[PDB]
Design a protein around this ligand. Structure first.
Ligand code: EF2
Ligand code: ZN
Lengths: 370, 1091
């Protein structure tokens, strides 16, 4: 069993404690048009509810956020379809929740912790002289649908409220979707569209990853739940945008289950056929899932996946604890044995009593679920 | 695209029913809710008295009667699904009946989540308030003009059921609620003066884990009766009484009713149709009924069973059990088509005449329903007598009340038939002539008989049969036209008319006149409270083409209508429908004119023309179910009846009828003698209504239906529930269609507690008998069914798409596509193709099979080796539930409205994604309208229509039609129940048994009718005063947008029903081009002909 504190990674301690906390929440009306600034050195895709850690040092970026605190506190994170030609049709708003200004080495620096809020549709990208871009965006509403049976049942059967759990779920299907007999589809088909059902199917995989998971930590709402899960699936950029376009929590859960089931092996994106790890080696060392976004000392965001065993990897150099994202663990650079692609790191415990004693931190940009 | 939607058949299913004194405080009333309809009745004790039927602009959710303090009768509260609240009072003054709104308002909250256990509408016993549970965590209160409402923060979020407690100083509500600890019953006191809740009279007593309903019991008992799965408990503070009867374990109790007003007996009903008696605690099983949605005790012993899954009932609760042991006996059955889960249009009987065969009901109430437009005749005798020119019934015995003689007329001859019970025999009536053609004969005044021939008027006595009197024209001329009642005779001799009176042994000539032109037709039917003596004579004339109302005996002209044309009036008739007097006049071209007639003045008003046939129409009056009707004999035989003081014309299902008369004999009672070109047929008439419904009970669930012409039979997918027996299999619950098959078969496996058993039924298109039943594999769920020809093969195959369903599996991993051939009265399995998923849909795609396997869409080629071969695949990322096609254009559908259009490239042999749309909402049905449009059913009982230079424009579909139907459509079908202004015809079947029709309109015709709708809504008074625009507004829990690209046919059709000055108001300045009321009458009439 694991004795590492799963809460520790989510707090980004490497970013330093003693940060100015902000409580106040900003939310834009559905379908409403907004003009939000864009951070020039952010190239990651942010899912709503996801924590984005930043370390900004470029004067124009520092001034941008410094001014952003004085107002809205929200910026735009673009989901690039082509990161080279900087093309994006969708994105997510990031609201700063923790902030800290420092001054060192002749420069003014700022460290932030933001959270994904609202998905948007890009309407136009205007550029300012300082390098910071502004984005005319249209807020995409979250589409909540009622029970599949809500409409068809306007009757007496309405007042029938929702191992060995197996029989409860069968009694649940038989009861909740009894009025399917009035329709042209079976109860087993309506289950494939039931939020509670689809969630319990995902919760099954989440528990295979976090063996010490307590259901109280998981969000009750399928809106918050679908998004939490979306942000921890090690998938390619093309599939991630497709997931971000999804408006329904049901369509999202159904999608995530397809990804979770069809998934088997995770290879090196560069040489494509070199297998690095498998679905069975994935595990949650953080409460926000097996995969999460972290910043290196130069502000580059690495979305890293925690796995117990990795295969064609070569380590170089000696372990380091500097800027470690998992306190108590030391990192050592890992590259693909075949091509030399930087795959992530090997994390090793600094104390004999720690569990896991070793794991692998793989960046999703290096992986390909092919 | 602009569409038109009209109701072919109103909803049949019962949503709710109540008893009280709504009309008068004397009459016991039964109010039935059929969704958008309200049927009001009086308990006849010897039947059911239909008083009024009112339509509403909403779906009924709540319906409960109440009498607040001093009132002449009862006030009715109704709450719609769109949260329209209203109090209705009954108002009657003579033949005029009107429902009156007392208070109205919309109770919907700006925010809040609609509760899981539905809308709960309770009323305080002292009529102090209205309690509404629409949203969880709030309790809305309406103290019973604008229906003022307020909320109270209800701490317990999950409320199962709630009722207002009887006999309380301060109003109290008792509710069953569930929390993570368990399910407990609680009490709260509702204060009006403080607008808040305060602690209830008794403690939160713990109830059953599956406690479902609260039954508020009146004084001297008080408190509540909580009903669960296994237990029935009673709570009254310190008073407790817990019972667990085994008889209620099989099925959950879903409905109840109060039998004794004090609260000593209660009716209980389960999901399996069992009826129980809760005596005050003891429970006794009474018997079996239809699966009751609602129950109502009325009068003594009689009970109303309101069924939504099957036919509604009237049953008698006898004090003594029969031989079988049932205290329940079925009295009357009421046709319910709902739910329509699938249907098809088939030209059964006659080609061009479409019939609609549906998969109706569920479980033991499962049936097939055949819906055919027109009234039918039930033949009891058929005789070869060609060229009949007339039919008249007679009573040869004055002592007898029944007809025993039938008199036939032929070219220059007369034959007489006698009815010796069921035996028809050729005879000769003494006094009557056989060598002359008869124009009239019948029983007349002073126990006599008359016979008007081309030569004379003959009067014959009945004891004995002999000629007592005879009348002739003075110059021995021939009688041209003739009319006769019981006391009077009016005969025409070219232009001349003669008025005679039937006296004892005398035919007295009273008066005579000369007409302006030749006489074409005559009528002297006595109308109103006239004791067989008519003061009026109706006459049609040649050359001038005029319908004239003449006074008797003077022959004075009272009215003269100029019918217009070169076509002479052939038949004329004075009649009475629903106490209103009318004049009917039929022309030689098959055209019928119908006016209202004033008995005193003679004035013909409200001229209406209706085209019946191609041949001259003959009008004969007949009696059916103690109601006067008119049979219109032509190549399109028609019954002319009255419905809401407006004349209705329903067709008869007969090739042609030339002449007819009503025959009431000892052998043929309350019958109709009909004559065509070759034969005379004696028979009984069906129900005088627009549509006819034949019921084929299956006693199991019908799911899918298709038709094979080459086999003269239907393919029906059905399922039956079987229980797990103490053996290696399962046993049936009752005999059903799939068990009682003529020839049976089972699937042979080749692939690797209540059970659902699936079957492919074979039913004959005439007899409707199960010729064959093919039982599917264990755990095999049959989904799709199609009867077509594939590839080069000339044999039609019944193809079924299945799914292997297991509890552990979420999405089926296996499935089959089974090809069957129906030959020699037995299904022969041709091909068995195993697929890696569920076969939700299948469609014949230009000689190929297009079938869905979960997310994938497959195209199969039918080889000479007689086995399907995989051609091309399309992987969609969305479940292929819906699969519709037209040419090389394919529609792929999801339950969440995710539609994507595919195109098969013949030379490439691959699928191309034309367009896509992803806007989440629940979708129940979809159909392709044309090359560029498609129709569908959306969440919250709505209908929609989607249409088709730049790629980012062409690859996207646009929502052109939005309409709130108020119904849940399960099936769309191309076809018509009828034998141009509009384009196409798509029928639709709903959960409530409602059938509808969707047709296309032109851009300007849409605007004309839309403008008309806005004007009609200013004239028409809405029940409960709901705005039509609001009712039709595309509604979801999120958005409510006004209806677009759709015309409410039901509303448009009520223009022909409004008063003539109100029609003038609607058409005034309507229109640019000007529009006459006469122009708009023709347009609206033309639209009624589509259904
Ligand atoms: O836990 C970790 C893994 C290593 C990671 N890391 C980097 O990605 C990096 C890039 C360049 C210079 C220094 C670093 C460093 O410490 C880091 O910051 N934390
Ligand atoms: Zn590599």
């Amino acid at each position: 069993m694991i004795n590492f504190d799963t809460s520790l990674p989510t707090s980004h301690m490497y970013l330093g404690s003693d940060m100015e906390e902000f409580h106040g929440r900003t939310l834009h009306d559905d379908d409403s048009c907004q003009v939000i600034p864009v951070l020039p050195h952010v190239m990651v895709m942010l899912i709503p509810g996801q924590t984005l850690p930043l370390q900004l040092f470029h004067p124009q970026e520092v001034s941008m956020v410094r001014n952003l605190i004085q107002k809205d506190r929200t910026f735009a994170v673009l989901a690039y379809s082509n990161v080279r030609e900087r093309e994006a049709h969708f994105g997510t708003t990031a609201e700063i929740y923790a902030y800290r200004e420092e001054q060192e080495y002749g420069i003014e620096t700022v460290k932030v912790k933001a959270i994904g809020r609202q998905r948007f549709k890009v309407l136009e990208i205007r550029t300012q002289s300082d390098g910071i871009q502004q984005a005319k965006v249209q807020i995409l509403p979250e589409r909540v649908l009622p029970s599949t049976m809500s409409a068809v049942q306007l009757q007496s059967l309405s007042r029938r409220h929702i191992r060995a759990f197996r029989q409860w779920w069968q009694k649940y299907q038989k009861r909740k979707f009894h009025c399917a007999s009035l329709t042209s589809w079976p109860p087993w088909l309506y289950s494939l569209y039931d939020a509670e059902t689809l969630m319990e199917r995902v919760k099954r995989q989440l528990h295979e990853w976090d063996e010490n998971l307590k259901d109280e930590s998981l969000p009750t709402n399928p809106i918050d739940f679908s998004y939490r899960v979306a942000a921890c699936l090690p998938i390619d950029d093309a599939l991630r945008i497709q997931l971000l376009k999804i408006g329904s929590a049901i369509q999202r859960l159904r999608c995530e289950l397809d990804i979770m089931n069809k998934c088997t092996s995770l290879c090196c994106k560069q040489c494509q056929d070199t297998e690095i790890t498998t679905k069975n080696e994935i595990f949650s060392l953080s409460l926000c899932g097996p995969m999460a976004a972290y910043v290196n000392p130069h502000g580059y965001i690495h979305e890293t996946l925690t796995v117990y065993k990795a295969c064609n990897l070569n380590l170089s150099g000696r372990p380091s604890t500097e800027h470690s994202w998992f306190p108590g663990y030391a990192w050592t650079i890992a590259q693909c044995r075949i091509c030399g692609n930087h795959m992530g790191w090997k994390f090793t415990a600094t104390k004999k009593d720690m569990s896991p004693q070793k794991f692998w931190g793989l960046t999703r940009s290096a992986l390909l679920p092919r | 695209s602009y569409n038109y939607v009209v109701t072919a058949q109103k909803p049949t299913a019962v949503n709710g029913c109540v008893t009280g004194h709504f009309t008068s405080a004397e009459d016991l009333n039964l109010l039935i809710a059929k969704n958008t309809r309200l049927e009001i009745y009086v308990v006849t004790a010897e039947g059911l008295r239909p008083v009024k039927e009112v339509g509403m602009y909403g779906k009924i959710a709540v319906m409960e009667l109440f009498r607040p303090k001093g009132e002449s009768k009862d006030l009715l509260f109704i709450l719609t699904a769109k949260y329209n609240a209203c109090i209705l009072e009954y108002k009657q003054s003579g033949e005029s009946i009107d429902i009156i709104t007392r208070a109205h308002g919309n109770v919907q909250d700006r925010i809040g989540r609609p509760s899981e256990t539905g809308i709960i509408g309770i009323i305080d016993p002292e009529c102090r308030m209205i309690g509404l549970r629409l949203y969880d965590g709030l309790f809305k209160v309406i103290p019973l003009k604008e229906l003022k409402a307020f909320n109270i923060r209800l701490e317990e979020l999950h409320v199962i059921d709630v009722k207002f407690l009887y006999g309380c100083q301060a109003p109290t509500i008792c509710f069953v609620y569930q929390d993570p600890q368990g399910r407990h019953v609680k009490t709260y006191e509702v204060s009006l003066r403080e607008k808040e809740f305060n602690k209830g009279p008794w403690k939160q007593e713990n109830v059953e884990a599956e406690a479902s309903m609260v039954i508020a019991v009146p004084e001297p008992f008080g408190g509540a009766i909580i009903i669960g799965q296994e237990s029935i408990t009673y709570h009254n503070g310190d008073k407790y009484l817990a019972i667990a009867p085994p008889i209620i374990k099989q099925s959950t109790i879903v409905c109840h009713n109060r039998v004794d007003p004090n609260g000593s007996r209660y009716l209980l009903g389960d999901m399996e149709g069992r009826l129980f008696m809760l005596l005050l605690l003891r429970v006794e099983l009474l018997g079996e009924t239809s699966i009751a949605e609602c129950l109502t005790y009325l009068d003594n012993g009689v009970v109303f069973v309101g069924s939504r899954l099957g036919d509604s009932q009237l049953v008698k609760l006898n004090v003594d059990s029969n031989e079988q042991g049932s205290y329940v006996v079925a009295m009357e059955t009421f046709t319910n088509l709902g739910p329509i889960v699938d249907m098809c249009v088939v030209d059964l009987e006659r080609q061009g005449q479409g019939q609609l065969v549906t998969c109706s009901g569920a479980f033991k109430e499962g049936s097939l329903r055949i819906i055919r437009n027109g009234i039918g005749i039930h033949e009891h005798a058929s005789i070869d007598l060609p060229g009949i020119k007339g039919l008249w019934p007679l009573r040869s015995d004055p002592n007898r009340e029944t007809d025993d003689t039938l008199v036939l007329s032929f070219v220059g001859q007369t034959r007489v038939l006698m009815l010796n019970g069921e035996e028809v025999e050729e005879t000769e009536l003494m006094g009557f002539v056989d060598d002359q053609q008869t124009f009239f004969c019948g029983n007349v005044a002073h126990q006599q008989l008359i016979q008007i021939t081309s030569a004379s008027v003959r009067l014959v006595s009945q004891e004995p049969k002999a000629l007592v009197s005879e009348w002739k024209e003075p110059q021995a001329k021939n009688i041209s036209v003739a009319s006769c009642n019981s006391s009077q005779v009016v005969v025409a001799v070219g232009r001349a008319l003669y008025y005679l009176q039937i006296h004892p042994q005398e035919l007295r000539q009273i008066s005579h006149t000369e007409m302006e032109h030749e006489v074409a037709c005559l009528d002297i039917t006595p109308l109103g409270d006239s004791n067989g003596l008519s003061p009026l004579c109706a006459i049609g004339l040649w050359t001038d083409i005029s319908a004239r109302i003449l006074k008797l005996p003077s022959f004075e002209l009272l009215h003269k209508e100029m019918l217009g044309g070169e076509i002479i009036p052939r038949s004329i008739l004075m009649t009475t429908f629903e106490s209103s007097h009318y004049l009917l006049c039929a022309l030689g071209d098959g055209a019928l004119f119908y006016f209202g007639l004033n008995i005193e003045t003679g004035l013909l008003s409200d001229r209406k023309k209706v085209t019946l046939g191609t041949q001259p129409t003959v009008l004969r009056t007949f009696r059916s179910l103690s109601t006067t009707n008119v049979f219109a004999c032509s190549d399109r035989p028609t019954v002319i009846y009255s419905s809401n003081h407006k004349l209705v014309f329903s067709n008869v299902n007969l090739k042609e009828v030339n002449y007819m008369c009503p025959l009431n004999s000892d052998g043929y009672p309350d019958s109709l003698a009909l004559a065509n070109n070759s034969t005379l047929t004696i028979g009984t008439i069906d129900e005088i209504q627009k549509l006819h419904i034949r019921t084929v009970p299956l006693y199991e669930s019908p799911r899918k239906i298709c038709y094979q012409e080459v086999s003269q039979c239907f393919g029906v997918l059905s399922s039956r529930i079987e229980v797990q027996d103490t053996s290696g299999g399962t046993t049936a619950l009752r005999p059903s269609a799939s068990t009682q098959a003529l020839s049976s078969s089972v699937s042979s496996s080749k692939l690797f507690e209540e059970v659902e058993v699936h079957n492919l039924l074979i039913i004959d298109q005439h007899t409707f008998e199960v010729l064959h039943a093919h039982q599917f594999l264990q755990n095999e769920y049959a989904l799709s069914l199609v009867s077509c020809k594939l590839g080069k093969d000339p044999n039609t195959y019944f193809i079924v798409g299945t799914a292997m369903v297991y509890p552990e599996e979420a999405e089926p991993k296996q499935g089959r596509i089974v090809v069957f051939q129906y030959s020699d009265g037995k299904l022969q399995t041709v091909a068995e193709k195993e697929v890696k998923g569920a076969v939700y849909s299948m469609v014949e795609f230009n000689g190929k099979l297009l079938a869905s396997i979960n997310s994938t869409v497959r195209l199969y080629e039918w080889t000479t080796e007689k086995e399907l071969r995989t051609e091309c695949n399309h992987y969609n990322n969305i479940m292929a539930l819906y699969l519709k096609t037209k040419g090389d254009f394919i529609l792929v559908g999801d339950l969440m409205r995710s539609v994507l259009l595919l195109a098969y490239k013949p030379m490439e042999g691959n699928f191309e994604e034309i367009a896509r749309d992803f806007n989440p909402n629940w979708m129940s049905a979809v159909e392709i309208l044309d090359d560029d449009n498609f129709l569908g059913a959306e969440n919250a009982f709505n209908l929609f229509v989607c249409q088709k230079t730049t790629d980012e424009e062409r690859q996207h579909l646009q929502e052109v039609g939005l309409f709130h139907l108020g119904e849940f459509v399960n099936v769309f079908c191309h076809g018509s129940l009828v034998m141009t202004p509009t384009q196409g015809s798509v029928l639709f079947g709903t959960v409530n048994g409602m059938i509808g029709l969707v047709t296309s309109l032109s851009e300007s015709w849409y605007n004309l009718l839309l403008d008309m709708q806005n004007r009609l809504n200013k004239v028409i008074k809405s029940v409960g005063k709901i705005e039509h625009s609001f009712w039709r507004s595309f509604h979801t829990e999120r958005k409510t947008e006004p209806a677009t690209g759709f015309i409410d046919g039901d509303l448009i059709e009520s223009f022909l029903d409004i008063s003539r000055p109100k029609m003038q108001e609607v058409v005034a300045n309507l229109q640019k081009r000007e529009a006459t009321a006469d122009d708009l009458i023709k347009v609206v009439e033309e639209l009624t002909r589509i259904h």
